[PDB]
Amino acid sequence: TDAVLELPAATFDLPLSLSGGTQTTLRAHAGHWLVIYFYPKDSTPGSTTEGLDFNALLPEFDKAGAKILGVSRDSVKSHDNFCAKQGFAFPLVSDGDEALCRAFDVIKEKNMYGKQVLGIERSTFLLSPEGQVVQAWRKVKVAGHADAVLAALKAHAK
């Protein structure tokens, strides 16, 4: 009744390749809040700003016991470079096959260039300690976004 999105059950057991060489799964994050932010491409201005914004707010997320995951379809090596360059203290998911993206339905289509063009739409989600998607932001505007996500988390966690 509180879920704004229903994920296929298998989503929670998908092995998610992380920056740094390990994997996680959504089920492995049971027991705490999880912020999942999707962005199209490593190292672009918008995505760097978004990542730096979350990073700067990390202690506030820590206060709530929450964890952050950034997600794009870039490689682990790209993610490692991006993370090292920017100093991110949270992991990035290398969703190269877009399995996680599809589960969250963030692969959106646009009729452009006389074609049907599919791409990651910047989107963010809040997953409860019990794995429910309780809030979604789509077609995300970077400015003020991380602040808004934090506020929403604090409202939901209470």
User: How many chain residues bind Na ion (CB under 5 A)?
Assistant: 4
Nearest-CB residue to Na ion? 17
Torsion sign, CA atoms 62, 32, 7, 92: positive
Stretch that binds Na ion, among 57-65, 78-86, 104-112, 122-130 (CB under 5 A): 122-130
In angstroms, what is the minimal distance from the CB of 81 to Na ion? Answer: 17
Buried b (16+ CB within 10 A) or exposed e, 89-113: ebbbbbbeeeebbebbebeeeeeee
Site for Na ion in 125-154 (CB under 5 A): 127
In angstroms, what is the minimal distance from the CB of 35 to Na ion? Answer: 10
Under the binding rule (CB under 5 A), the answer on residue 67 touching Na ion is: no
Binding Na ion by CB under 5 A: which of 18, 29, 104, 140? Answer: 29
Dihedral over alpha carbons 149, 141, 69, 85 (to 10 degrees)? -120
In angstroms, what is the minimal distance from the CB of 73 to Na ion? Answer: 10
Token pair in block for residue 64? 């709530």
Stretch that binds Na ion, among 32-40, 44-52, 55-63, 150-158 (CB under 5 A): 32-40
In angstroms, what is the minimal distance from the CB of 112 to Na ion? Answer: 29
Site for Na ion in 1-20 (CB under 5 A): 17
In angstroms, what is the minimal distance from the CB of 49 to Na ion? Answer: 26
The residues that touch Na ion, with contacts defined as CB under 5 A, are: 17, 29, 34, 127
